[PDB]
Design a protein around this nucleic acid. Sequence first.
DNA 1: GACCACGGCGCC
DNA 2: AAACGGCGCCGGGTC
Length: 539
Amino acid sequence: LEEAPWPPPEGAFVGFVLSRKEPMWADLLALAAARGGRVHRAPEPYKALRDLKEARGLLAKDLSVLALREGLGLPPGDDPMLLAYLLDPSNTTPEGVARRYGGEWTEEAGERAALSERLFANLWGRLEGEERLLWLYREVERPLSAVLAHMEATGVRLDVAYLRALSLEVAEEIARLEAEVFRLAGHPFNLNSRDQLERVLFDELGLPAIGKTEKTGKRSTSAAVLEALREAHPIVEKILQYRELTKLKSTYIDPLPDLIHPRTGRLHTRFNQTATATGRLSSSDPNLQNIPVRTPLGQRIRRAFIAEEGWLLVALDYSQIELRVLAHLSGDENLIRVFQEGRDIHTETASWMFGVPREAVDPLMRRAAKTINFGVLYGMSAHRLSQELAIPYEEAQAFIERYFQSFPKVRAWIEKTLEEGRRRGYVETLFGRRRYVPDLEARVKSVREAAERMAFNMPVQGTAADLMKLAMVKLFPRLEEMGARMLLQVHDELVLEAPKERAEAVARLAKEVMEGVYPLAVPLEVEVGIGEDWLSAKE
DNA sequence: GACCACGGCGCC
DNA sequence: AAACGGCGCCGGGTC
Ligand SMILES: Nc1nc2c(ncn2[C@H]2C[C@H](O)[C@@H](COP(=O)(O)OP(=O)(O)OP(=O)(O)O)O2)c(=O)[nH]1
Ligand SMILES: [Mg+2]
Ligand SMILES: [Mg+2]
Ligand SMILES: [Mg+2]
């Protein structure tokens, strides 16, 4: 390309090199831009950010986030990763996309600008005639990238002192457990080593092996195995308690306080827009989509996620979302009616399965009923369903056959979906997001059947993801104008921050936007709550 | 130090 | 584990 002085004209494709992948923590090492046969390299990349009107190119969102960190309003625009990811969601990395669509991801910003420009040209070509994908790009993914840049740059407030204090208390309770385990073993070992634990449980204590591990065929020590073994020996209960505590401490209590950003005083995740096979977002560095919520200690952790002083969190979560989506996709008259009538399938299952009235169903029971309801739907075995309730291969199954014959268009929807996927090589969401599933004609039954469950799950999980993305795009500007913030997405949930005085109004508005995003054959209901912390805002 | 593959497990 | 799906982060062998 012809070498040309910095600054580029309007509409050029940017290339940029970061010291590390996380845009909130990165040093911008280099910046360049490409357009009309010319490449322009920035002498001083931070100053040079100020000359751009938008970030247009590979990983546009990440540069935008870095710009926002520096007080610049540089929105992301076209990004070939989003075009590629819509063509085939196994397109997840710039190395891969480049190789597939016409160049090489190098460590030079100029080359990255040039690559961005030519990959955009090519990928735009490939989306010719692909009207549903183009709609997804223009109406969902491209505008969503700007929303995600703001969310990443804004961050969430964390009660650091609370977590530090909690760490010290949890350390003591862990020592009590590990000491008991070692006493019961008759010797110490590394309790964090599942290989050492395997030897102790099954060789030294002679407990029965239940299951084997997937890749290397060891005797499993997983929670399902230990649960089965609870009454065999008192060590097993102590191992389960130890695992619960150490998981929480090593994954959340300890690391999160050290990730507070020195200039914002907040915690900044990354929302990865080209990372899943179904069209969901992911969250990393750290992951804020798997913050604990279920156990007593997990609830304590979730309490550390708090609002700015004088603000409240507003948590909004779609009710029974994949079930509603499935009603629409299958057009099943019975399931449509269940929702027309305001029923709750999770609560009904929980009530039935624990034998208590609906008013006695607690959050733990509701979570177990979800496992049941989504499990059966997405192809859980009669064998595992036996054990989950868990009662027997008698009335563990039969249950599947009734579940399905109640909703006869579901079976037909699955079979239509699978037969389409075999012929086409892909399945799709309501909006035409695609997932290629080639193993549908595999000849190893276990491989083929795994593929099938992947394949029919995707239109449901993926349509739910499309809806949430669209809600985000519609909701974001409404929040800006109200002086509220969008903080987190958790698949079917949004966490917002609002000034106390406006929090109620924000909650109503956000709820209505999410409920009316794209009407289906059943209502979408959203549960909304407000509080000083993320837990109180869902309670 | 960082890489991976694994088992394991947190959330949706 | 058990053949529900989708993720990302934690703590033996290698380089
Ligand atoms: N296949 C599968 N999908 C799940 C599972 N747990 C959650 N999901 C998917 C389906 C849910 O509809 C969606 C959102 O999770 P939620 O915990 O909000 O559940 P849901 O919206 O169904 O119920 P809610 O009324 O919000 O409690 O994520 C699971 O165990 N298996
Ligand atoms: Mg929900
Ligand atoms: Mg949810
Ligand atoms: Mg893994």
